[PDB]
């Protein structure tokens, strides 16, 4: 993720594939321009549950995590992005997608599986280690049943920041 320039304050930010952004933590807080194509080609494949290292010209490569993007309503084009500086140890309240595996009852004989919460906010005390996904096997539950967060297994030392009892997936009756 090479960066040519880091503009100060309101600048040209040409629509020649330039996106404003920042990265910030306790100490340093840098500057703007990125790249629409390289960013969004990277932002899809790295979700928000994982990092990539950017560097303005000169030897300053440095870890960062995508956190909050801001884009054009009345459009779908990203305009601005926030990065948080990775610390290599302290826990970070990373979001994690909830996926699914297998065919449940209803998925064979009845209604559809429903991911009632697409993204949990587990604390995951992991520097480099993050869960890019979170698989939830459903071949068990029947119509009317719903898996809550208490039995959403959390990989390798990662506490849940949500309620134990809140519903996360729920096979639902047809129609």
């Amino acid at each position: 993720m090479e960066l040519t320039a880091k503009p100060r304050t309101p600048k040209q930010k040409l629509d020649e594939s330039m996106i404003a952004a920042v990265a910030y933590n306790k100490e340093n807080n840098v500057s703007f321009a990125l790249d629409r194509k390289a960013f969004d080609r990277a932002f899809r494949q790295q979700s928000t549950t994982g990092l990539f290292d950017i560097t303005v010209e000169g030897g300053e490569t440095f870890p960062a995590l995508v956190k909050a993007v801001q884009m054009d309503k009345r459009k779908r084009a990203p305009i601005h992005v926030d990065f948080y500086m990775v610390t290599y140890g302290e826990p970070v309240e990373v979001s994690v997608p909830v996926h699914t595996t297998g065919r449940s009852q209803g998925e064979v004989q009845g209604g559809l599986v429903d991911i009632v919460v697409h993204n949990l906010q587990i604390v995951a005390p992991g520097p480099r280690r993050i869960p890019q996904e979170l698989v939830v096997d459903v071949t068990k539950m029947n119509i009317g049943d719903h898996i809550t967060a208490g039995d959403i297994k959390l990989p390798e030392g990662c506490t849940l920041a949500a309620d134990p009892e809140l519903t996360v997936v729920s096979v639902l009756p047809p129609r």
């Binding site: 932002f43 899809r44 928000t48 909050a68 993007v69 884009m71 054009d72 309503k73 009345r74 459009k75 779908r76 979001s95 209604g111 559809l112 599986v113 429903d114 993204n119 639902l172 009756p173 047809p174 129609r175």
Partner: protein, 135 residues
């Protein structure tokens, strides 16, 4: 459709959409690209058409809701009374606001239901997928 209590009269102004969150709830959605009023007539028409394409399905929210009383005056008269009663409620819809939202169907089988819904609505609209997560 109609709401249960109110006040019952209003007005008119416009600017671009405040809170149109993309895809909460569903996987896929349709999204207005022009400002308009939209009728409970037209919302329920989109409902009744998309139900037929997803028969026993059940994957349809309506994150949009008629709300504004609007008041055609009686048909004979010169200007003079106050206002007519309301006929027909409408919800405002600014570009980039999401209106429709299905989940759990193949793209093409949802894209076709959105095409059928967009021929019933008074605005140009777009069909979309996923990316952004706010909070």
């Amino acid at each position: 459709k109609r709401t249960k209590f109110r006040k019952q009269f209003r007005g008119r102004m416009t600017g671009d959409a405040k809170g149109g969150d993309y895809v909460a709830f569903g996987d896929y959605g349709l999204i207005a690209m022009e400002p308009a009023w939209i009728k409970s007539n037209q919302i329920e028409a989109c409902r009744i058409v998309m139900s037929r394409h997803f028969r026993r399905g059940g994957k349809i929210y309506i994150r949009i809701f008629p709300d504004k009383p609007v008041t055609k005056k009686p048909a004979e008269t010169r200007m003079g009374k106050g206002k007519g009663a309301v006929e027909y409620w409408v919800s405002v819809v600014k570009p980039g606001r999401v209106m429709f939202e299905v989940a759990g169907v193949t793209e093409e089988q949802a894209k076709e239901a959105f095409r059928l819904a967009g021929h019933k609505l008074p605005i140009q609209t777009k069909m979309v997928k996923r990316e952004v997560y706010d909070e």
